[PDB]
């Protein structure tokens, strides 16, 4: 009737930490731009977009 367990492993493996951290960071940054656009009329990274004028 026993489950006959294998040895214990930790939850937060390095891959879970890396992939969750990068994905949650990208989603949080996207929400930060959607909130920053309502305050100022443009996204935050658009301030870094400096192309030459077409003329």
């Amino acid at each position: 009737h026993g489950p006959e367990l294998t040895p214990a492993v930790p939850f937060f493996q390095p891959y879970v930490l890396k992939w969750a951290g990068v994905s949650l960071g990208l989603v949080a940054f996207y929400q930060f731009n959607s909130s920053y656009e309502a305050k100022n009329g443009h996204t935050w990274v658009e301030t870094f977009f400096h192309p030459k004028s077409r003329e």
Binding site: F48, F49, H50, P51, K52, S53, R54
Partner: protein, 486 residues
Amino acid sequence: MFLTSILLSSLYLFNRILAWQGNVKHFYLFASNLLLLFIVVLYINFNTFSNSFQFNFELFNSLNPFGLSNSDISNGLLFGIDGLSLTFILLTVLLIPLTLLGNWYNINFNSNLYYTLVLAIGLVILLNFWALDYISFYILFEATLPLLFILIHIYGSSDSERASFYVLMFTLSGSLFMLLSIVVISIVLNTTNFINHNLFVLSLDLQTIIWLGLFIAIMVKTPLFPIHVWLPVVHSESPLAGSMILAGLILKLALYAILRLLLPLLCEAQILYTPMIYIISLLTIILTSLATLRQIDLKVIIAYSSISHMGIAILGVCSNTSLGIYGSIVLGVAHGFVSPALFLIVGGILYDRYHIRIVNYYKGLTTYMPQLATYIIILSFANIGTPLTGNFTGEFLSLQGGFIRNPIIGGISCISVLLAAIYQLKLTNKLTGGISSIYMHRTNDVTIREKFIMNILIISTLIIGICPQIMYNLLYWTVNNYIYII
């Protein structure tokens, strides 16, 4: 003085890293990773709202042979980008460290040679997409081949010699008639240029002749059915980085050259000849994907797979449609992602361990390598045209554009979705399932570097698969540019 002092500093730092570290491969990775940083900072300053060529520079002008030139008279070699160039440059530059990564422990004997040749090939195919003359496109179009000959000959399988010969021979022999056609353009117009050349009109009897010389070279390099002949052996007897840079970048370079060189000034020719291209395109989709079924070797299958996908790709280019052009670009970029991962799976994880590429030895790879078998299946299904991967977006918009221009050619062109699945899943279930093979003794699981390469080359398919709009900001000019619907 400033830009010369930078070079005198960096060559000195190079010499010192040589004197203290025997390899260079750290400095080569560092340089190619810096090239990434530089090209994405060029992407930030890129204006998408202009059809123009934004970042222009002349080399080898009369008044300044060594360096930049600001003169009222220009005869050197021009360079610059639009959106259409820049997409491939992105697909180029993120591939370049990975092949420099891809042989980090395989090559033991002569390290610095091999990594120098691999980085030099990658830099030449960087500058292929910057070029703006017909001659400056062509000088670097063929700068690759000595480096490829020396790379395939010195390192490879037991049959390095014949494969290095064929990559010189067929590629050269098509490129010579390409040069014939370039000469005939350069003596009529007296100007090789990627800027003005849609303005000039040639006679229909004169476009009729010029276009054959460029098109048979593109038949050689995107291997269409009459000469699709070097492609399996130059893969199957290559080393790893040569095969990756070949099938990820050289075939897409000729897919780029059919856009950049032919569709602007051969338009009135090009309409008269789209049925010949559709003959050869359908006949290289059907008959190469059918020859995949009878194969004993394992890298050769992924080679003929690349032939079948480029055969799908070029009938979106010659489709005279917005859909077909955009689908050919997204197929070219997504195949450049998914295909070097497959050449890693046959060449890196599976030839470094057992050193024999015959299919008959390999059975039941799941029970000793579960996460490799996981890769083999999700890279299998990404190759076929199973969606949310970017390969299906290319295949779908290419088949749709090919259905516009001629519906009956699209009807038999559409069965490629079946024919591309047959051999790929026939390989995948033989590798994935069964009792583990009595020939193969058990070896190591897939290492961290190989899983790193794989994770990048699979995320970069999935992002284009979930949203192909992420790179429409570059192409929406160049999708409208090449269309001739009067």
